Amino acid sequence: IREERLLKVLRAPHVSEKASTAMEKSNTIVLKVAKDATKAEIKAAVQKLFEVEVEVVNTLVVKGKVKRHGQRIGRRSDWKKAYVTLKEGQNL
Amino acid sequence: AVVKCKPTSPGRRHVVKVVNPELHKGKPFAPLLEKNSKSGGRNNNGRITTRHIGGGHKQAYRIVDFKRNKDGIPAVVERLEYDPNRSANIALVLYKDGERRYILAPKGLKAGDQIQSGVDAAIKPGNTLPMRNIPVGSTVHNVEMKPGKGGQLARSAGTYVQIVARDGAYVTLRLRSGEMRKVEADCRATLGEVGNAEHMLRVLGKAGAARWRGVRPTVRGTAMNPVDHPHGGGEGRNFGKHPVTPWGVQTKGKKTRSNKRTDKFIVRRRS
Amino acid sequence: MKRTFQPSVLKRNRSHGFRARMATKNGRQVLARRRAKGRARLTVS
RNA sequence: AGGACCGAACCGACUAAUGUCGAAAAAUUAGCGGAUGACUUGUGGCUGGGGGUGAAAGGCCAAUCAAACCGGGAGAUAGCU
RNA sequence: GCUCGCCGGAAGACCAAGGGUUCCUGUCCAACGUUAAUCGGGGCAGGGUGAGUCGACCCCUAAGGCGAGGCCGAAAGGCGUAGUCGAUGGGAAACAGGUUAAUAUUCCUGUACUUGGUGUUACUGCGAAGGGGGGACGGAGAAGGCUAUGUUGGCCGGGCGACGGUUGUCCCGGUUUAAGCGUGUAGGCUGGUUUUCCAGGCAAAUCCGGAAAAUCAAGGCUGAGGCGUGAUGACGAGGCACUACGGUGCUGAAGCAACAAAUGCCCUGCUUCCAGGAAAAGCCUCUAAGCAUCAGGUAACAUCAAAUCGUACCCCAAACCGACACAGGUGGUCAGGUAGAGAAUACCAAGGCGCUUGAGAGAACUCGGGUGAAGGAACUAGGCAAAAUGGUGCCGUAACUUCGGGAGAAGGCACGCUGAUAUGUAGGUGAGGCGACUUGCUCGUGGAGCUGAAAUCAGUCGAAGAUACCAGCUGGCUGCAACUGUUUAUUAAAAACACAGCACUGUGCAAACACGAAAGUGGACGUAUACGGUGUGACGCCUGCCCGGUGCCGGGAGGUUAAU
Ligand SMILES: [Mg+2]
Ligand SMILES: [Mg+2]
Ligand SMILES: [Mg+2]
Ligand SMILES: [Mg+2]
Ligand SMILES: [Mg+2]
Ligand SMILES: [Mg+2]
Ligand SMILES: [Mg+2]
Ligand SMILES: [Mg+2]
Ligand SMILES: [Mg+2]
Ligand SMILES: [Mg+2]
Ligand SMILES: [Mg+2]
Ligand SMILES: [Mg+2]
Ligand SMILES: [Mg+2]
Ligand SMILES: [Mg+2]
Ligand SMILES: [Mg+2]
Ligand SMILES: [Mg+2]
Ligand SMILES: [Mg+2]
Ligand SMILES: [Mg+2]
Ligand SMILES: [Mg+2]
Ligand SMILES: [Mg+2]
Ligand SMILES: [Mg+2]
Ligand SMILES: [Mg+2]
Ligand SMILES: [Mg+2]
Ligand SMILES: [Mg+2]
Ligand SMILES: [Mg+2]
Ligand SMILES: [Mg+2]
Ligand SMILES: [Mg+2]
Ligand SMILES: [Mg+2]
Ligand SMILES: [Mg+2]
Ligand SMILES: [Mg+2]
Ligand SMILES: [Mg+2]
Ligand SMILES: [Mg+2]
Ligand SMILES: [Mg+2]
Ligand SMILES: [Mg+2]
Ligand SMILES: [Mg+2]
Ligand SMILES: [Mg+2]
Ligand SMILES: [Mg+2]
Ligand SMILES: [Mg+2]
Ligand SMILES: [Mg+2]
Ligand SMILES: [Mg+2]
Ligand SMILES: [Mg+2]
Ligand SMILES: [Mg+2]
Ligand SMILES: [Mg+2]
Ligand SMILES: [Mg+2]
Ligand SMILES: [Mg+2]
Ligand SMILES: [Mg+2]
Ligand SMILES: [Mg+2]
Ligand SMILES: [Mg+2]
Ligand SMILES: [Mg+2]
Ligand SMILES: [Mg+2]
Ligand SMILES: [Mg+2]
Ligand SMILES: [Mg+2]
Ligand SMILES: [Mg+2]
Ligand SMILES: [Mg+2]
Ligand SMILES: [Mg+2]
Ligand SMILES: [Mg+2]
Ligand SMILES: [Mg+2]
Ligand SMILES: [Mg+2]
Ligand SMILES: [Mg+2]
Ligand SMILES: [Mg+2]
Ligand SMILES: [Mg+2]
Ligand SMILES: [Mg+2]
Ligand SMILES: [Mg+2]
Ligand SMILES: [Mg+2]
Ligand SMILES: [Mg+2]
Ligand SMILES: [Mg+2]
Ligand SMILES: [Mg+2]
Ligand SMILES: [Mg+2]
Ligand SMILES: [Mg+2]
Ligand SMILES: [Mg+2]
Ligand SMILES: [Mg+2]
Ligand SMILES: [Mg+2]
Ligand SMILES: [Mg+2]
Ligand SMILES: [Mg+2]
Ligand SMILES: [Mg+2]
Ligand SMILES: [Mg+2]
Ligand SMILES: [Mg+2]
Ligand SMILES: [Mg+2]
Ligand SMILES: [Mg+2]
Ligand SMILES: [Mg+2]
Ligand SMILES: [Mg+2]
Ligand SMILES: [Mg+2]
Ligand SMILES: [Mg+2]
Ligand SMILES: [Mg+2]
Ligand SMILES: [Mg+2]
Ligand SMILES: [Mg+2]
Ligand SMILES: [Mg+2]
Ligand SMILES: [Mg+2]
Ligand SMILES: [Mg+2]
Ligand SMILES: [Mg+2]
Ligand SMILES: [Mg+2]
Ligand SMILES: [Mg+2]
Ligand SMILES: [Mg+2]
Ligand SMILES: [Mg+2]
Ligand SMILES: [Mg+2]
Ligand SMILES: [Mg+2]
Ligand SMILES: [Mg+2]
Ligand SMILES: [Mg+2]
Ligand SMILES: [Mg+2]
Ligand SMILES: [Mg+2]
Ligand SMILES: [Mg+2]
Ligand SMILES: [Mg+2]
Ligand SMILES: [Mg+2]
Ligand SMILES: [Mg+2]
Ligand SMILES: [Mg+2]
Ligand SMILES: [Mg+2]
Ligand SMILES: [Mg+2]
Ligand SMILES: [Mg+2]
Ligand SMILES: [Mg+2]
Ligand SMILES: [Mg+2]
Ligand SMILES: [Mg+2]
Ligand SMILES: [Mg+2]
Ligand SMILES: [Mg+2]
Ligand SMILES: [Mg+2]
Ligand SMILES: [Mg+2]
Ligand SMILES: [Mg+2]
Ligand SMILES: [Mg+2]
Ligand SMILES: [Mg+2]
Ligand SMILES: [Mg+2]
Ligand SMILES: [Mg+2]
Ligand SMILES: [Mg+2]
Ligand SMILES: [Mg+2]
Ligand SMILES: [Mg+2]
Ligand SMILES: [Mg+2]
Ligand SMILES: [Mg+2]
Ligand SMILES: [Mg+2]
Ligand SMILES: [Mg+2]
Ligand SMILES: [Mg+2]
Ligand SMILES: [Mg+2]
Ligand SMILES: [Mg+2]
Ligand SMILES: [Mg+2]
Ligand SMILES: [Mg+2]
Ligand SMILES: [Mg+2]
Ligand SMILES: [Mg+2]
Ligand SMILES: [Mg+2]
Ligand SMILES: [Mg+2]
Ligand SMILES: [Mg+2]
Ligand SMILES: [Mg+2]
Ligand SMILES: [Mg+2]
Ligand SMILES: [Mg+2]
Ligand SMILES: [Mg+2]
Ligand SMILES: [Mg+2]
Ligand SMILES: [Mg+2]
Ligand SMILES: [Mg+2]
Ligand SMILES: [Mg+2]
Ligand SMILES: [Mg+2]
Ligand SMILES: [Mg+2]
Ligand SMILES: [Mg+2]
Ligand SMILES: [Mg+2]
Ligand SMILES: [Mg+2]
Ligand SMILES: [Mg+2]
Ligand SMILES: [Mg+2]
Ligand SMILES: [Mg+2]
Ligand SMILES: [Mg+2]
Ligand SMILES: [Mg+2]
Ligand SMILES: [Mg+2]
Ligand SMILES: [Mg+2]
Ligand SMILES: [Mg+2]
Ligand SMILES: [Mg+2]
Ligand SMILES: [Mg+2]
Ligand SMILES: [Mg+2]
Ligand SMILES: [Mg+2]
Ligand SMILES: [Mg+2]
Ligand SMILES: [Mg+2]
Ligand SMILES: [Mg+2]
Ligand SMILES: [Mg+2]
Ligand SMILES: [Mg+2]
Ligand SMILES: [Mg+2]
Ligand SMILES: [Mg+2]
Ligand SMILES: [Mg+2]
Ligand SMILES: [Mg+2]
Ligand SMILES: [Mg+2]
Ligand SMILES: [Mg+2]
Ligand SMILES: [Mg+2]
Ligand SMILES: [Mg+2]
Ligand SMILES: [Mg+2]
Ligand SMILES: [Mg+2]
Ligand SMILES: [Mg+2]
Ligand SMILES: [Mg+2]
Ligand SMILES: [Mg+2]
Ligand SMILES: [Mg+2]
Ligand SMILES: [Mg+2]
Ligand SMILES: [Mg+2]
Ligand SMILES: [Mg+2]
Ligand SMILES: [Mg+2]
Ligand SMILES: [Mg+2]
Ligand SMILES: [Mg+2]
Ligand SMILES: [Mg+2]
Ligand SMILES: [Mg+2]
Ligand SMILES: [Mg+2]
Ligand SMILES: [Mg+2]
Ligand SMILES: [Mg+2]
Ligand SMILES: [Mg+2]
Ligand SMILES: [Mg+2]
Ligand SMILES: [Mg+2]
Ligand SMILES: [Mg+2]
Ligand SMILES: [Mg+2]
Ligand SMILES: [Mg+2]
Ligand SMILES: [Mg+2]
Ligand SMILES: [Mg+2]
Ligand SMILES: [Mg+2]
Ligand SMILES: [Mg+2]
Ligand SMILES: [Mg+2]
Ligand SMILES: [Mg+2]
Ligand SMILES: [Mg+2]
Ligand SMILES: [Mg+2]
Ligand SMILES: [Mg+2]
Ligand SMILES: [Mg+2]
Ligand SMILES: [Mg+2]
Ligand SMILES: [Mg+2]
Ligand SMILES: [Mg+2]
Ligand SMILES: [Mg+2]
Ligand SMILES: [Mg+2]
Ligand SMILES: [Mg+2]
Ligand SMILES: [Mg+2]
Ligand SMILES: [Mg+2]
Ligand SMILES: [Mg+2]
Ligand SMILES: [Mg+2]
Ligand SMILES: [Mg+2]
Ligand SMILES: [Mg+2]
Ligand SMILES: [Mg+2]
Ligand SMILES: [Mg+2]
Ligand SMILES: [Mg+2]
Ligand SMILES: [Mg+2]
Ligand SMILES: [Mg+2]
Ligand SMILES: [Mg+2]
Ligand SMILES: [Mg+2]
Ligand SMILES: [Mg+2]
Ligand SMILES: [Mg+2]
Ligand SMILES: [Mg+2]
Ligand SMILES: [Mg+2]
Ligand SMILES: [Mg+2]
Ligand SMILES: [Mg+2]
Ligand SMILES: [Mg+2]
Ligand SMILES: [Mg+2]
Ligand SMILES: [Mg+2]
Ligand SMILES: [Mg+2]
Ligand SMILES: [Mg+2]
Ligand SMILES: [Mg+2]
Ligand SMILES: [Mg+2]
Ligand SMILES: [Mg+2]
Ligand SMILES: [Mg+2]
Ligand SMILES: [Mg+2]
Ligand SMILES: [Mg+2]
Ligand SMILES: [Mg+2]
Ligand SMILES: [Mg+2]
Ligand SMILES: [Mg+2]
Ligand SMILES: [Mg+2]
Ligand SMILES: [Mg+2]
Ligand SMILES: [Mg+2]
Ligand SMILES: [Mg+2]
Ligand SMILES: [Mg+2]
Ligand SMILES: [Mg+2]
Ligand SMILES: [Mg+2]
Ligand SMILES: [Mg+2]
Ligand SMILES: [Mg+2]
Ligand SMILES: [Mg+2]
Ligand SMILES: [Mg+2]
Ligand SMILES: [Mg+2]
Ligand SMILES: [Mg+2]
Ligand SMILES: [Mg+2]
Ligand SMILES: [Mg+2]
Ligand SMILES: [Mg+2]
Ligand SMILES: [Mg+2]
Ligand SMILES: [Mg+2]
Ligand SMILES: [Mg+2]
Ligand SMILES: [Mg+2]
Q: Which of A81, B232, B257, C13 allows an S-S link to C17, with CB 3.0 to 4.6 Å?
């Protein structure tokens, strides 16, 4: 079910307070995904790579901040994060 | 009846309404209705071709039957209705077979009366016949200029054509203008006079009445500046030029008929 | 107090957008010009 | 019933004062007119420059109008400063 | 932190548009901030936007746009047909509570619902580029039934007075709960069926339309609400608990009744009027081309699914439009108390703010206000400006009139508070009862409580009782314009424009005329009781003479007369 490509979806685990509070209490994992990456493709990726029972994936697109570097203005890249809820069989 | 309105307000004072009691108080027959969106007097190019039109009340088109294609089928008049896109009233005719159509209501007509149309039929108001079969010296309306077509002449309230003479294939008609026109005898004509003759006795009474009829204000040439209209300028109410349209063609007695094709059919021009 | 610029992104793009310029021969020459001059913002988009 | 009456919202702009390098390239304060209609307003269309639109003032058409704006002819032309 | 002040139909709370990180935390004050700044919408890091149900995308269309062929046009290209786009409109479904420093109808808990695929199964005619139905519609008005919401009792927990009183008719606080599902009411709307038959709805139809009937009188449809579940729940005023004086984490009582009441909802309804009030899909239904154990429908237990994008924050503003942290502009939604007719106004609640230079002094003069002896328009171009009048009820109200008006003419009088009539009245209002009528959200008594004007009479205080805010100045003669309306955005609002009405005139429909090299469009899906142009400008009384001149119209002999 969409082999090879699934590996390119998940970029990194997200580190934050909101990310931490949703580990123990809500039983989810926040993580940075590819700008494409549908909820099915994230779920299916977590199901094989991380190998845990996924309840549901909620997804959102974060907009890049407009920073500075003296004169030349620059905008950061629009990355996409995925709150992935897990089932009772959880770990990481 | 033609009821004058009481002067409870300036603007009401001069109002004179044409209150027809027989008309239907209710929504019309939907299958014959369709949309009729307004132009505002502008065309393809989006420009005012005809001035002084715009706004007014929204109004739906009733598909009125000018052709009268049903031959030898009787038809009962179900109810008379108000038509907002027309001077005359209309009658919801129910054909014996099942069909319903709107027609222009003639004078002597009510909810219940029977109408037949075709070749034979009877000589009576409302019945549509070819002008060959119709007796000479008789009042008709909704007259076709071309056989098989709709019905062009005398469709306005109280309007009627009189058949003067009958020269073989042609029929000489005296029209409401005073013009005597020669049409083909095969063309049809609905017998009698078009109803709602009181229409012209209506007097609106206020500016707003014309506005909600879709008319906009006419500004006199003389009021304008010379750049705008041939009558124009002057320091305080001048004129001193011959009356003319905004495009300089003379009005006020200046023949603009120039068809040439149809001049053969016109027996005698109006006066 | 009711100024000339009353912004609307739909109107903006319908009036001055890339496709609105692409629709017409005169509009394609505008783009041709901005490209020739070498602009970054070829149209408002 | 009403282009009816009084009167808030809303739309307007009659008078006065202030302001006039303003708080504001047209406003404020106190009064003022319309306020179910020819009303008002949101959103989206259409009309293009001798052209539009104009209940007509030469009004309005992006703070520009007896002929918009931008580029070009173009270093127009100037018996004038 | 405690006072004080201000807004409160906003200066509060949600949005759309538009912005585009301005949101939150930590840190830093060079510049930015009209002053200082430890603070900041500033700098710099990091964090923050979680959807089958909200919106967008998606199915459908209006105005309009584009437009295969096509018609038209020196070229460019214009118009437009089948189509395809285009919301500001139509079309499936989720709520209450809890939660973050920053999101929540999206996370969480408890309850729900909606459309699909693929099954399973019993049962069966399905099937359109097609027909019919529905969607599906205006203004105004009126009335009833409701609800949001409030108020007052009861009830429950606390209180016993910083200064005389206060164990009470006393004081403070609370009295909350949704979609869903069940119920089908106040009420709206409609004669049901059953059979046959028929030149109609381009074909076909059992559907729609029409025509016979026969036959019981109702059967459907729509619908607020309320009640019952939802809800041994949720929540709940204080307590306790701990203190990192941030709060963390435990419980948690009553949790009712009457009255009042919308501009909300039934009502897309009803009555009425004319100026006569989108479209198209979803939806329901009928059959053609077909298909006939079939595929297809129908139902029911499943099951799998419901992708993508927006979601922070401002949003009458220091974040949008105005060059500014600008005394301007900016669409929708929510609408608490007391007084009041009220969304006016005053004072307040929720909630939010004190407008990013202050401190003194208390000259002239300027600005915005208050008061003023005697006089009272003598000012001045002009009562400009100020002052004054102002509410409700009742009495009264002239010429003139188009018979409506004028008219709120004018001008008067009464208004507070307290008892009484009446331990709160007519009125509204409805309970425990009791007929009964059946199965009800019943009819009709019945009138316990709450609610409550307006009066009259008698007292009574003040200088003044519509005591504040709020809230006409009035009359006479007269020019112009009938009137409401429109107008020089930014020195002119008028007698100017428009106007209903009036006349002349053109126009016989491939209409005149207008836009357009043209095709073609408007006029008009109109047809002389119509349409265009011109002037005049309600209404009443009228509108006189001149056709030499200029135009226009008609006439065709004669003169002159181009191209050929
Ligand atoms: Mg769920
Ligand atoms: Mg979820
Ligand atoms: Mg999302
Ligand atoms: Mg964002
Ligand atoms: Mg980038
Ligand atoms: Mg980065
Ligand atoms: Mg890059
Ligand atoms: Mg109706
Ligand atoms: Mg048309
Ligand atoms: Mg065009
Ligand atoms: Mg076009
Ligand atoms: Mg156009
Ligand atoms: Mg015209
Ligand atoms: Mg006209
Ligand atoms: Mg019409
Ligand atoms: Mg006129
Ligand atoms: Mg006029
Ligand atoms: Mg004219
Ligand atoms: Mg004038
Ligand atoms: Mg003028
Ligand atoms: Mg001229
Ligand atoms: Mg003049
Ligand atoms: Mg003169
Ligand atoms: Mg003269
Ligand atoms: Mg001339
Ligand atoms: Mg012309
Ligand atoms: Mg001329
Ligand atoms: Mg700009
Ligand atoms: Mg806009
Ligand atoms: Mg535009
Ligand atoms: Mg009025
Ligand atoms: Mg106000
Ligand atoms: Mg206002
Ligand atoms: Mg506004
Ligand atoms: Mg305004
Ligand atoms: Mg003024
Ligand atoms: Mg103004
Ligand atoms: Mg006033
Ligand atoms: Mg006002
Ligand atoms: Mg008035
Ligand atoms: Mg008023
Ligand atoms: Mg009024
Ligand atoms: Mg009215
Ligand atoms: Mg617009
Ligand atoms: Mg234009
Ligand atoms: Mg011209
Ligand atoms: Mg031109
Ligand atoms: Mg002038
Ligand atoms: Mg020019
Ligand atoms: Mg010029
Ligand atoms: Mg220029
Ligand atoms: Mg030069
Ligand atoms: Mg040259
Ligand atoms: Mg206050
Ligand atoms: Mg309020
Ligand atoms: Mg806020
Ligand atoms: Mg919020
Ligand atoms: Mg929201
Ligand atoms: Mg939002
Ligand atoms: Mg900006
Ligand atoms: Mg936004
Ligand atoms: Mg920044
Ligand atoms: Mg700190
Ligand atoms: Mg700090
Ligand atoms: Mg410092
Ligand atoms: Mg430094
Ligand atoms: Mg430093
Ligand atoms: Mg600074
Ligand atoms: Mg500073
Ligand atoms: Mg602060
Ligand atoms: Mg900070
Ligand atoms: Mg902040
Ligand atoms: Mg910050
Ligand atoms: Mg900052
Ligand atoms: Mg820096
Ligand atoms: Mg750091
Ligand atoms: Mg870093
Ligand atoms: Mg959801
Ligand atoms: Mg969605
Ligand atoms: Mg959910
Ligand atoms: Mg939401
Ligand atoms: Mg939705
Ligand atoms: Mg999408
Ligand atoms: Mg093409
Ligand atoms: Mg092809
Ligand atoms: Mg082509
Ligand atoms: Mg042709
Ligand atoms: Mg071509
Ligand atoms: Mg074209
Ligand atoms: Mg075009
Ligand atoms: Mg086209
Ligand atoms: Mg095809
Ligand atoms: Mg089309
Ligand atoms: Mg399509
Ligand atoms: Mg479409
Ligand atoms: Mg929409
Ligand atoms: Mg919308
Ligand atoms: Mg919609
Ligand atoms: Mg829907
Ligand atoms: Mg929608
Ligand atoms: Mg819904
Ligand atoms: Mg909903
Ligand atoms: Mg927030
Ligand atoms: Mg909720
Ligand atoms: Mg969950
Ligand atoms: Mg469920
Ligand atoms: Mg379901
Ligand atoms: Mg299946
Ligand atoms: Mg199935
Ligand atoms: Mg089987
Ligand atoms: Mg069938
Ligand atoms: Mg079928
Ligand atoms: Mg179908
Ligand atoms: Mg509608
Ligand atoms: Mg209506
Ligand atoms: Mg309306
Ligand atoms: Mg009315
Ligand atoms: Mg009315
Ligand atoms: Mg009542
Ligand atoms: Mg009653
Ligand atoms: Mg009742
Ligand atoms: Mg209630
Ligand atoms: Mg209320
Ligand atoms: Mg109240
Ligand atoms: Mg009390
Ligand atoms: Mg006690
Ligand atoms: Mg004491
Ligand atoms: Mg005591
Ligand atoms: Mg209380
Ligand atoms: Mg309370
Ligand atoms: Mg309850
Ligand atoms: Mg619901
Ligand atoms: Mg259900
Ligand atoms: Mg039921
Ligand atoms: Mg029932
Ligand atoms: Mg029902
Ligand atoms: Mg049922
Ligand atoms: Mg009944
Ligand atoms: Mg048939
Ligand atoms: Mg055909
Ligand atoms: Mg049958
Ligand atoms: Mg039938
Ligand atoms: Mg209910
Ligand atoms: Mg119910
Ligand atoms: Mg309810
Ligand atoms: Mg309960
Ligand atoms: Mg219990
Ligand atoms: Mg609790
Ligand atoms: Mg608590
Ligand atoms: Mg409990
Ligand atoms: Mg309990
Ligand atoms: Mg009540
Ligand atoms: Mg009530
Ligand atoms: Mg009501
Ligand atoms: Mg209202
Ligand atoms: Mg409301
Ligand atoms: Mg309604
Ligand atoms: Mg089978
Ligand atoms: Mg099957
Ligand atoms: Mg299940
Ligand atoms: Mg299921
Ligand atoms: Mg499943
Ligand atoms: Mg899907
Ligand atoms: Mg928000
Ligand atoms: Mg706000
Ligand atoms: Mg505000
Ligand atoms: Mg608002
Ligand atoms: Mg605000
Ligand atoms: Mg700004
Ligand atoms: Mg500017
Ligand atoms: Mg600017
Ligand atoms: Mg400031
Ligand atoms: Mg401001
Ligand atoms: Mg300010
Ligand atoms: Mg304003
Ligand atoms: Mg809006
Ligand atoms: Mg509302
Ligand atoms: Mg209030
Ligand atoms: Mg009150
Ligand atoms: Mg107020
Ligand atoms: Mg206060
Ligand atoms: Mg407060
Ligand atoms: Mg408070
Ligand atoms: Mg605020
Ligand atoms: Mg504060
Ligand atoms: Mg302060
Ligand atoms: Mg400050
Ligand atoms: Mg100071
Ligand atoms: Mg001193
Ligand atoms: Mg002083
Ligand atoms: Mg001194
Ligand atoms: Mg001084
Ligand atoms: Mg000064
Ligand atoms: Mg002073
Ligand atoms: Mg002053
Ligand atoms: Mg005073
Ligand atoms: Mg003073
Ligand atoms: Mg004074
Ligand atoms: Mg004095
Ligand atoms: Mg004194
Ligand atoms: Mg005195
Ligand atoms: Mg005196
Ligand atoms: Mg005097
Ligand atoms: Mg004197
Ligand atoms: Mg004097
Ligand atoms: Mg003097
Ligand atoms: Mg004088
Ligand atoms: Mg004067
Ligand atoms: Mg004055
Ligand atoms: Mg005084
Ligand atoms: Mg005063
Ligand atoms: Mg005073
Ligand atoms: Mg007073
Ligand atoms: Mg009085
Ligand atoms: Mg009164
Ligand atoms: Mg009188
Ligand atoms: Mg007199
Ligand atoms: Mg009278
Ligand atoms: Mg008088
Ligand atoms: Mg009277
Ligand atoms: Mg009086
Ligand atoms: Mg009086
Ligand atoms: Mg008078
Ligand atoms: Mg009082
Ligand atoms: Mg008493
Ligand atoms: Mg009582
Ligand atoms: Mg009583
Ligand atoms: Mg009752
Ligand atoms: Mg009982
Ligand atoms: Mg009693
Ligand atoms: Mg009784
Ligand atoms: Mg009582
Ligand atoms: Mg007394
Ligand atoms: Mg007394
Ligand atoms: Mg006292
Ligand atoms: Mg006394
Ligand atoms: Mg008194
Ligand atoms: Mg007073
Ligand atoms: Mg008054
Ligand atoms: Mg006189
Ligand atoms: Mg004089
Ligand atoms: Mg005189
Ligand atoms: Mg006069
Ligand atoms: Mg006038
Ligand atoms: Mg006159
Ligand atoms: Mg005006
Ligand atoms: Mg205007
Ligand atoms: Mg104006
Ligand atoms: Mg001006
Ligand atoms: Mg000017
Ligand atoms: Mg004026
Ligand atoms: Mg002025
Ligand atoms: Mg007039
Ligand atoms: Mg006449
Ligand atoms: Mg051309
Ligand atoms: Mg032609
Ligand atoms: Mg045509
Ligand atoms: Mg049409
Ligand atoms: Mg005529
Ligand atoms: Mg005039
Ligand atoms: Mg005149
Ligand atoms: Mg007259
Ligand atoms: Mg006369
Ligand atoms: Mg002569
Ligand atoms: Mg002639
Ligand atoms: Mg002639
Ligand atoms: Mg001649």
A: C13
> Is A35 in a helix, a strand, or coil?
coil
Half-sphere exposure of B261 (CA within 13 A, CB side): 1
What's the CA C3/C1' E10 distance, rounded, in angstroms?
26
Q: Which nucleotides of D are covered by protein (CB under 7 A)?
A: 1-4, 24, 26-27, 37-39, 43-48, 52-58, 62-63, 66-67
Q: What is the distance in A from the centroid of ligand 258 to the CA of B37?
A: 7
Sign of dihedral through CA atoms B131, B133, B136, B140? negative
CA gap B267, B179 in Å, rounded = 8
List the A45 CA – E414 C1' distance (angstroms).
90
**CA–CA dist B181, B171 (Å, integer):** 8
The residues facing B268 across adjacent strands are B180
Q: Does domain B195-271 have CATH number 4.10.950.10?
A: yes
Method: cryo-EM
Is the domain spanning B1-113 CATH 2.40.50.140? The answer is yes
Q: Is the CB of B238 under 7 A from strand E?
A: no
- CA separation for the pair B50, B263 (Å, rounded): 27
Distance B227 CA to ligand 30 centre (A): 30
Q: Looking at chain B, which residues constitute the CATH 4.10.950.10 domain(s)?
A: 195-271
| Per-residue burial over A20-46, b = 16 or more CB atoms within 10 Å of its CB, e = otherwise | eebeeeeebbbbebbeebeeebbbbbb
d(CA B87, CA B77): 20
How far apart, in whole angstroms, are the C-alpha atoms of residue B160 and residue B162?
A: 7
- Give the residue range(s) of CATH 2.40.50.140 domains in chain B: 1-113
Question: Which residues have Cβ atoms closer than 7 angstroms to strand D?
Answer: B 8-12, 42, 45-48, 51, 54, 206-209, 211-212, 216-217, 219, 223-229; C 1, 4-6, 8, 10-11, 14-15
Distance A42 CA to ligand 200 centre (A): 90
B126: nearest Cα among B105, B100, B99: B105
Interatomic CA distance for residues A39 and A34, integer angstroms? 11
Q: Give me the phi and psi of B42, to 5 degrees please.
A: -115, 160
